[PDB]
UniProtKB/Swiss-Prot annotation, chain A:
Disulfide pairings: C28-C33, C40-C114, C61-C184, C162-C165
Residue positions with a glycan: N138
Role played: Component of the membrane attack complex (MAC), a multiprotein complex activated by the complement cascade, which inserts into a target cell membrane and forms a pore, leading to target cell membrane rupture and cell lysis. Complement C5b is generated following cleavage by C5 convertase and initiates formation of the MAC complex: C5b binds sequentially C6, C7, C8 and multiple copies of the pore-forming subunit C9.
Activity regulation note: Membrane attack complex (MAC) assembly is inhibited by CD59, thereby protecting self-cells from damage during complement activation. MAC assembly is also inhibited by clusterin (CLU) chaperones that inhibit polymerization of C9.
Subunit structure comment from the entry: Complement C5b is composed of complement C5b and complement C5 beta chains that are associated via disulfide bonds. Component of the membrane attack complex (MAC), composed of complement C5b, C6, C7, C8A, C8B, C8G and multiple copies of the pore-forming subunit C9. Interacts with the tick complement inhibitors OmCI, RaCI1 and CirpT1. Interacts with cobra venom factor (CVF).
Protein name, as recorded: Complement C5b
Organism of provenance: Homo sapiens (Human)
NTR domain segment(s): 40-184
Compartmental location: Secreted; Target cell membrane
Curated annotation (Swiss-Prot), chain B:
Sites carrying sugar chains: N55
Chain's gene name: C7
Known function: Component of the membrane attack complex (MAC), a multiprotein complex activated by the complement cascade, which inserts into a target cell membrane and forms a pore, leading to target cell membrane rupture and cell lysis. The MAC is initiated by proteolytic cleavage of C5 into complement C5b in response to the classical, alternative, lectin and GZMK complement pathways. The complement pathways consist in a cascade of proteins that leads to phagocytosis and breakdown of pathogens and signaling that strengthens the adaptive immune system. C7 serves as a membrane anchor.
Native organism: Homo sapiens (Human)
Entry superkingdom: Eukaryota
Lineage summary: Eukaryota, Metazoa, Chordata, Craniata, Vertebrata
Segments for region (Factor I module (FIM) 2): 72-144
Name the UniProt record assigns to this protein: Complement component C7
Family: Belongs to the complement C6/C7/C8/C9 family.
Residues of the full protein shown: 700 to 843 of 843
Amino acid sequence: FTVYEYHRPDKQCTMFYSTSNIKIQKVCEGAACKCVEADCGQMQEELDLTISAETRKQTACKPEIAYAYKVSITSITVENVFVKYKATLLDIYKTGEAVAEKDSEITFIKKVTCTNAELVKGRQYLIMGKEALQIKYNFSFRYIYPLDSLTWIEYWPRDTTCSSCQAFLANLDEFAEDIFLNGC
Amino acid sequence: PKCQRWEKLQNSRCVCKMPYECGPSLDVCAQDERSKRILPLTVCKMHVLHCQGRNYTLTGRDSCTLPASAEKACGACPLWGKCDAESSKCVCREASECEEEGFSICVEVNGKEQTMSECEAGALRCRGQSISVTSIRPCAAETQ
């Protein structure tokens, strides 16, 4: 798709496209960026009563699982296939391949087809999925999470027992403790 | 890089290990991270948790139902023992059969406190010797 001004013919502009649907896609604030396979999915409902804490352990124990933590959503970004979703890291359980210690506050990006996986700024949360693509325009792309399809997501209660009820947060604490003390 | 019994060093530096990777430690009594209640625990998992900044509390040798508090059967033996030939019971090893790295821990023996290896204390416990564990940390007894 391209144009020039007929009254100013030096003023030429161009962009590249195709009719075929695209699936090899990731975007970054740098000269080379990673790629993902059209990645989008859906989150769980907030404050869910007596939800399956053992299923959270089974999900974190999966062979595809290599990101898993509890954090506060800090801020968001604008490039629509990878709106960055910055964080405030509270704890980690399987942050995985070539990762290190917590409180790094790094991105966990999102895409416009994943409408069922929306996130709230300032909100405490729990999630699981694959590890980051490890290179960028920086010396590393370390912990720049993809938040790809089939990943786990839910809200983390900021105050528990008056919220009807504390047993949901205690089940999530038991899931986190099982991943820390027995693992996979 | 700077590894340890509760640790897992990386990137040319020291680091903590996962409490689940510390799971094979000897079982003992312990207490809650913010309450007086007693419960079962393991020394390596409690050390890895403390290396992650998690709270913990000590307990006496009889203060909880720790799985390793007595001699086991064949096919499930702790690191201080193994199955005997053509027998369903497990047997306790000599202190020279220390294949595991182990912590060093404080225990009372012959009426006196002394530092020994976690595997040697496990052998004395499994063989029914009169012992009483006092901390998952070593004693003052080696001071000079």
